[PDB]
Design an enzyme around this catalytic site. Sequence first.
Site, short mmCIF file in Angstrom:
data_model
loop_
_atom_site.label_atom_id
_atom_site.label_comp_id
_atom_site.label_asym_id
_atom_site.label_seq_id
_atom_site.Cartn_x
_atom_site.Cartn_y
_atom_site.Cartn_z
N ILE A 1 0.83 -1.21 0.00
CA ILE A 1 0.00 0.00 0.00
C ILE A 1 0.87 1.26 0.00
CG2 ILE A 1 -1.63 1.44 1.34
CD1 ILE A 1 -3.00 -1.03 2.32
N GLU B 1 4.68 3.30 2.11
CA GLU B 1 5.72 3.23 3.13
C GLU B 1 6.14 4.59 3.62
OE1 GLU B 1 9.74 1.99 1.63
OE2 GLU B 1 8.62 1.78 -0.25
N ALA C 1 9.08 6.52 6.82
CA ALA C 1 10.46 6.57 7.27
C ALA C 1 10.90 5.32 8.01
CB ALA C 1 10.68 7.81 8.16
N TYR C 2 9.99 4.68 8.74
CA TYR C 2 10.37 3.53 9.57
C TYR C 2 9.26 2.47 9.55
CZ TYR C 2 7.46 5.94 13.04
OH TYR C 2 6.42 6.56 13.70
N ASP D 1 -1.27 16.03 12.81
CA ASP D 1 -0.76 15.71 11.48
C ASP D 1 -1.89 15.41 10.50
OD1 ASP D 1 1.36 15.49 9.71
OD2 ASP D 1 1.59 13.33 10.00
C1 LIG Z 1 -5.57 0.86 0.24
N1 LIG Z 1 -5.16 2.13 0.84
N2 LIG Z 1 -4.59 3.22 0.17
C2 LIG Z 1 -4.35 4.16 1.05
C3 LIG Z 1 -4.77 3.72 2.31
C4 LIG Z 1 -5.26 2.46 2.16
N3 LIG Z 1 -5.81 1.61 3.12
C5 LIG Z 1 -5.57 1.65 4.48
N4 LIG Z 1 -6.36 0.93 5.27
C6 LIG Z 1 -6.17 0.91 6.58
C7 LIG Z 1 -5.13 1.63 7.14
C8 LIG Z 1 -4.31 2.36 6.28
C9 LIG Z 1 -3.22 3.25 6.75
C10 LIG Z 1 -2.47 3.92 5.78
C11 LIG Z 1 -1.51 4.79 6.18
N5 LIG Z 1 -1.27 5.01 7.50
C12 LIG Z 1 -0.24 5.99 7.86
C13 LIG Z 1 -0.38 7.17 6.89
O1 LIG Z 1 0.36 8.26 7.43
C14 LIG Z 1 1.14 5.40 7.75
C15 LIG Z 1 1.91 5.28 8.89
C16 LIG Z 1 3.17 4.73 8.80
C17 LIG Z 1 3.64 4.30 7.57
CL1 LIG Z 1 5.22 3.62 7.45
C18 LIG Z 1 2.88 4.42 6.44
F1 LIG Z 1 3.35 4.00 5.25
C19 LIG Z 1 1.62 4.97 6.53
C20 LIG Z 1 -1.95 4.37 8.47
O2 LIG Z 1 -1.71 4.60 9.66
C21 LIG Z 1 -2.97 3.46 8.11
N6 LIG Z 1 -4.58 2.35 4.97
#
Ligand SMILES: Cn1nccc1Nc1nccc(-c2ccn([C@H](CO)c3ccc(Cl)c(F)c3)c(=O)c2)n1
Length: 336
Positions: free
Chosen positions: A23, A25, A27-28, A141
Amino acid sequence: AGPEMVRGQVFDVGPRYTNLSYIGEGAYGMVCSAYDNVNKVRVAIKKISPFEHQTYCQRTLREIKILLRFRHENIIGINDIIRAPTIEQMKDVYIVQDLMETDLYKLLKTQHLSNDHICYFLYQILRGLKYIHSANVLHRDLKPSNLLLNTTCDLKICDFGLARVADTRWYRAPEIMLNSKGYTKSIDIWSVGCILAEMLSNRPIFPGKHYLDQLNHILGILGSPSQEDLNCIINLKARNYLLSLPHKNKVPWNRLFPNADSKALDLLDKMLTFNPHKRIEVEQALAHPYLEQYYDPSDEPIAEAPFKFDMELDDLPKEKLKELIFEETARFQPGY
Ligand SMILES: Cn1nccc1Nc1nccc(-c2ccn([C@H](CO)c3ccc(Cl)c(F)c3)c(=O)c2)n1
């Protein structure tokens, strides 16, 4: 077989969770979707690897504690957490969540929204924010990539890593850039105003390339701040910079967004107010005429009690934080 792997990153979440798909990525960490063979649905899984940095450990613990405490339709939950059976071996934490089909960042890259959808998304953002703020929490954020959308336009706020108990440049309130930490709940309202603007035009309203550029973008629309606006604690360098600038004229909202709903622009004006003390608050925003078709005070839950951290997280060495994370996640282990 082995643990599955995605873009170099080991994703050690089987056997329950399989058929991984990338989906995104950060920084960590990395986020994938996966098939859950117990609930027979696809879920999201966020792999986090925070233990080398005190900051990253803080964020991880804060998100886990807050999301496990919160209960609201417009806030993402946590269904499962996977990590190693011993603290020595724990290098990654996997947070399992309801899978949402997309986010608002992606959506705005491809779709022009009807006024009705802009209205409905804004309503859900503020409904979720009402609950967050009622818990005396600041998200800090808010931005389109932290607003998740499913197939039927349900919206959930995610990523509470930066959240704090009260007392991304483009979406950052002026007070943030004027203060070395000196701000309030209002910074979230600024972010929401930025997101509203972006939903109206499909482009970020203040896309600064750097700190100074961000201030210049903001003043480029709001105009030079007043004396009242500068009657606050401000960074000396920032104050001197602002005082060194030429006069900038205010640009009316209807000139920037010539085809937007006038009510939408009235609300936008009150959210994107330079002075946070004069900026609209979340309940007042929900009650704004723009949102009249969705506003339903009888169906906008608030938190049962204010949220409280039991320990000064900023003071804790990352090794103690890791121990707290191990403890917080124990309940998802077999034999608990
Ligand atoms: C299919 N699709 N496209 C976009 C989102 C989705 N679906 C989806 N469903 C459930 C949860 C999440 C989701 C995404 C991003 N993040 C943060 C965004 O800041 C996030 C933190 C840490 C790192 Cl490393 C990261 F890559 C993304 C979430 O916490 C949680 N996404």
